[model samples]
Target: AKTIKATGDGACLFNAVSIGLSVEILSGRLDSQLDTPGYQALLDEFAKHHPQFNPKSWKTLKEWLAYYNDTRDIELILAPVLFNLNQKYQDHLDEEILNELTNLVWKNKANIENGQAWFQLQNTGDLGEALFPKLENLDLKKDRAPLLDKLREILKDYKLELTRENVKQFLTEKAKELLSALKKKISSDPHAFQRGYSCDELKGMTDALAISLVENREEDITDNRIKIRLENQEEHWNVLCNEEDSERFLDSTPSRLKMTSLEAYRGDKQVSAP
Candidate 1:
């Protein structure tokens, strides 16, 4: 193993991972798995999944190395970003390996926290940081009335016909069912307060649906399934319901129902399946 060092500044996590992983690749530990083409594809998808990370010109790890190495006060990148990237390259790396690498960085992070590391961890706007408030608000809206009010606020601009009295009517049955499940999660689990079905994601789904409604775009709908492309044009579709339902699942987010699935495409290639 190589003894890699990272400045515990804003780019601490990214710096550490890149340096460590690069060493692994160069040392022939990852020879069979890591390559320019595969790593490049992961970087592209990571950028798409996290537009807020703002790696607009970064299509490869090499570009990111150049940028991060030169910059001092760049915004922080989180663990999930790296997790998402590693997931795409599952053929080469496992979550266990990535988790170990993260732990190594975190060990350095503690030194940063205790004022021992060379580079101090810097704070700036990050995707999760920006969405933290919205997620926290969902925590507060555990009660039915408050939850409905928050939902109404999120949906108000997109759907004028969607009101408190008949909000359920406007929502496809699956959407309502999703909301119901989320509500149960909020009520039953304390950790659920920290993740999933965040307010920003809610707005994003609504925005995509609004665009679909406005453009009257064609969708792939059948007795058991329906597919709609999201607003981001990322070539991903949400298959919300199955053949048994009269009303399809309309939300852009993935569903838990076995009958519903999500799929992603890279041009004509199906890169992922639900």
Candidate 2:
């Protein structure tokens, strides 16, 4: 809501702290130019330095960066050093983080999805309710690709084996998907098309929302379905992360999946299912 301008050496912020710590972790040296050993250390040190900003806290960097933007107000600071580091250290952070950061910086600030970036307007549905601002009216969509390019500068920060040209193309599709979906919903509503917009549009709008989360991929269950080896009974795949982290995950993220199913899957897989 409140916007302000700030200036500082990027080398002094939390990101610098991460780079410094990484220097210690990798080759046991704090070198300036980011290298394999340095970046790997930076990654580990970042995890250790910021527990609240840990691996399981978000599924993608986009989500994490949103939090980062929320907490640090990263956009206000004018530090090409940090900006350069950001692009250089792209993979060092999650994709979501990098993506959102790019949006925040280039878009001058985007409306948080707030569960309404995508909508379908039906005459009797609640989908028409638009909680997030659309970029079209502001004509900010034009800046998205350029902003993403700026964010990609971090690619030089860390030596990633992965090529992001493909990633950018992929993200372009995602951006289009979200915009296209929202546009369709907004275009269809008769009320929005006419006078009594907000009140009547909700019924006609498609209600679509997305949440961000960090997932320890090691624990991800594939497709939530498992084949039962039971000979003559109803067999369904049951899975549970029962690990200590599961509790933490549930407490933090709002929506919880069926843990019971996870428990059941574990029982079937590990126990004597005769």
Candidate 3:
């Protein structure tokens, strides 16, 4: 079994399977680019059916197979600190730094959701007005009032009240508290979080990729150095390939694996420049 490791980030599920299917998984449709009306119609059906996903988020056969495969869920954590959550950045402040902030927010979250903060954190008309920021494009050099109102609504979500007479003083105390636990999560439409995809969603994509995905938790060897940098295997993924059954698995080969269509329809070698 040729095991291939994928980047253990948010998209690892698709990454492993998608990367494998890249080794030419299907018999015909694997390389088709929707030229004829039938192909175009099929693609249209695909798009029409999949209004939930980003069409632009796809590339050629590999991405298409990723259904069988990958968001860069990086956030602007510190206006100064972007997706350094994965390192390769000059500053190596980790997810734990944000975790500290998340803990505070989630604590407030549990505090509220324990059905208690609605005792207080419930949204208010004042929260809506304080949260409005478009017309102003926004500011705060001359007017201190804007500053107080600025964090008011943001603070509301975390069960904070910035309507203090000395709100500026409190804002500093709650400054880093701005980024909450939600940002460190997978994100919601109304904002709320960061990173990673789910196992079920990955399983859903495998059917589209036409690969028989057999998950192997024991395949991982590290005691602590597992995927996603977490203690559990929540972020782990690897490809299993067998030469005897190459059609069902993702394989890594530099040899001639044509686009399934080209090989099946016209017999062309897979060679192109990026």
Candidate 4:
């Protein structure tokens, strides 16, 4: 009842006519009527108008049609031929799922970077159980257990434990001890004072003593601070401040005699040395 477009190459036209006629009269049935003398006469009449429809003139129209239909059916049925087609089917499905997962991660990259969104699954009702069968019938908290184990594995590489009770004090003491290691390195280096040090500058150094470096230029120094100079005008000394806390700082220093300054101050005005 419907018009079907088909190619003029005889083989292609033959296949299309077969499929179309199957869909029409036989209702998708492939049978022997399509191979009868009546069908052969039909093909000759069809080729009269469409001269380009040059099927195998030597073979009977029914024989050619049957061969083409069988070839087409084999191509459709055994296209992904293997010992088992399920492996290929599963591989294609896995690739599709992985591509969707990758796209989801990329879309939520910002949230993931800030530790906001960690895991995701496609939402097709049932809490994505249909897409991710592994997460089926599990509560949200239980689902996160595997993720937490992964984090623990990463922390193990750095020798870090997550069970500390007093995080503030524990972290502060750990930071101080780490910096103390850097301070020890600065103490050993001859040119430690020439360039001021920062927390970022002394990365990767182990258990070396490190202390704060306050700028001691002529304009910046206050009464609570002291002034000192290094060997050359270009070389700067790591000066110690003159306060009650100065003793505490000096106690922490590698060498007390290393401090060499021009002036001491109590306020805006300079003070005489005791």
Candidate 5:
């Protein structure tokens, strides 16, 4: 009941009829009718030979189509054929049926790709394009157990191959010793200087030997205080003065430290450093 809008290709009445017929056949609405007359001849031959299970042309066509869609139907049809063929040629099934079955499977390439062949029932769901990269050099086999084992082996190999290493090497002996010393020095100084560095970069590295023996001590350096300072440092400095008006907001008469010219004080501080 899906409304298919005829937006184009309605050039004439004949074109519309052709389009409708094409849709009907493609949608399998009239699958009982055969396009060629040869199928009727084949049905007659089959009926003459096997009168007990005299299948109609339309029934045979539907069954064969279903076999191409799924393997269970193929096996059901082949069961009777296999029994009769085996009775006629008891021990020659291996020689006769094996090659014939393999060729027939190849001839129906669509069915093979869709895993609708009897041989693919052995693969279950293991034989997929997604499983190919894992199975780079794997040896496959028939049956559920062996195929699953192969899949596991391939996945394990891929897992091992994909493991990455965080490599850290100074590449030369002098560079190596220099890096070792640098690591030790940074480890000893907790808040001696302002810098940004990652803890992971210095993890497990001995900064004791790299620093100096005179100031060597094992202590963890962290910058958690930096975040707190960023949040509240400005307010702490502005406690005594109104930042917007440059006015001394604190009463300095009790402390007797009331001073003017914060700029002059700052200049003097710089002069002292120089």
Candidate 6:
């Protein structure tokens, strides 16, 4: 076994996994939205699920990486990001998906929902009266009277409308659902997705794409999963993988390769270090 050190440019954890998994790395900026949607999707998740970590303060992907470099919360982003990592690729799909589905809650770019022009049946009592507040530029102070009305209003601003129609989206829970139409468009053939993938390191990503491209991909075809660790006093990550699979990757900033033998790698597992 060996440890491939990674540069600590706020992207070490991802790069480490990339090299360890024998996936592509480097040859790109750390902010390419086209190649990876890790940061924004994270913000999207937070926007709906964990609002306490507001997007405003952490707008730049670099900022989040820096946070993790110093001291991090694995549960904050990593867990959710890798929770259902093989979700369908979203590039070139969101625009059409959003466009095709607006009729359910929106009448036009200027309107909020599909209610009649002269004030049709929408809001409060009826559950279909969904809300998409930003569309209306709602005056919260005045619109505070009706709670369900506001809920329907706010929901209009959400992909929650996707729930009503069961539109497949990429929230981890939602990512589980697949859209045949989009998938069909992504690749005319079903073979590519029996397993799936993408590359070109940009700003953010979860995995190297092998897991997405191939079904039931194993971790190094070994007894244990890849174990990444950092020195208590270090800011970078060290990927521990079988020696044969360990190799150089672009953008890698390994100070030195720390090699170990498999038999002794866990000699102290049952014993606690002093």
Candidate with top TM-score is 3
Name the lDDT value of residue 251 in candidate 1.
17
Q: Would you list the C-alpha lDDT of every candidate in the order shown?
A: 0.31, 0.27, 0.33, 0.28, 0.25, 0.32
lDDT of 2 by residue, 1-274 (tens): 1111121222223222222222122232223423444334334433333334435321322243322231122221111122222333323223443343333323221122221121221112146532223322222344434333433443334332334454344434444444333343333222212221221122111111010111112322443311111111112111222334223221232321222322321222221101
Candidate 4 lDDT by residue in tens digits, 1-274: 1222322222222223233332322221224444545334344443432233346342333332333333233111111111011121222333333333333333333343345423443324344434432222233454334433333332233333333233223323333443333233333222322223332232211011111122323343443321121111122212222343222211232321211121100012221111
Model 2 residue runs over 4 Å out of place are 1-79, 88-274
Which regions of candidate 5 fall more than 4 Å away from where they truly are? 1-35, 48-50, 60-274
Looking at candidate 5, the ten consecutive residues that score lowest on lDDT are: 226-235
lDDT of 1 by residue, 237-272 (tens): 122212322111111223222210111111122212
lDDT per residue (tens digit) for residues 130-220 in model 6: 4432222222334222322432454454544344343323222332222333334333222222121222221123333212211123234
Report the lDDT tens digits of candidate 5 across residue range 1-274: 1221221211111111222222322235444443433324333433333334324555653434332222122222222221222122223323332232223322333443444533443222234322222111222332223433332332332222211120111112112443333233332222211122222222221121021111112233642110100111211110111232111211111221122222211222221100
> Which runs in model 4 stand beyond 4 Å of their true positions?
1-89, 117-139, 142-274
TM-score of 1: 0.26
lDDT of 2: 0.27
Candidate 3 residue runs with Cα over 4 Å from true position: 24-194, 208-212, 217-235, 244-273
Error of 1 at 102 (Å): 33
Which 10-residue window in model 4 sums to the lowest lDDT? Answer: 258-267
Output the TM-score of candidate 2.
0.18
Predicted structure 2: clash tally: 31
